[PDB]
Amino acid sequence: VTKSVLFVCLGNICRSPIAEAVFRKLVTDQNISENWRVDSAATSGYEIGNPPDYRGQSCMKRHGIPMSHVARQITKEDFATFDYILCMDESNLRDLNRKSNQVKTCKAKIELLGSYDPQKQLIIEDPYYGNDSDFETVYQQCVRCCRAFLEKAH
Asked: Is 37 a catalytic residue?
């Protein structure tokens, strides 16, 4: 059957849209995009409707990675339909775990995306109050973690 992954951050503007776009390009480059449902969402409603932070778009454009998204908040349905929910920081994880204990069906495994990093940079830190170099770090983390996740899901 199709496999699915939902990347999650607080606002779904800085971090999770990059993770989604990196993963989608990885599976498309490996001829298996059709086997995956890939998405991103927010724990909060703070940015609903908005495209990714344009600093993130600038970073993705440098790297040649297509990125298009409209921010949305995670829903109770997403816990039933996704195989994996991969989030950025421990505050996301606590939030997601709280929301997941409010539904009947939680198929998803809920984990830090950085738990996949061979370099063991566990937290993908919010770059909103940082600079271009922070978005670049987020990017690099997502490239390492997404490849590892694709090679062997936990």
From this structure: no
What dihedral do alpha carbons 13, 14, 16, 18 form, nearest 10°?
110
Q: Are 26 and 20 in contact (CB under 8 A)?
A: no
Give the resolution in Å.
1.5
Instruction: State the Cα–Cα distance between residues 57 and 17, nearest whole angstrom.
Output: 10
Active-site annotation holder among 95, 117, 126, 145: 126
Domains annotated on the chain, with CATH: 1-154 (3.40.50.2300)
Residues 6+ apart with CB under 8 A from 152: none
29 tagged catalytic? no
Contact 75, 107 (CB under 8 A): no
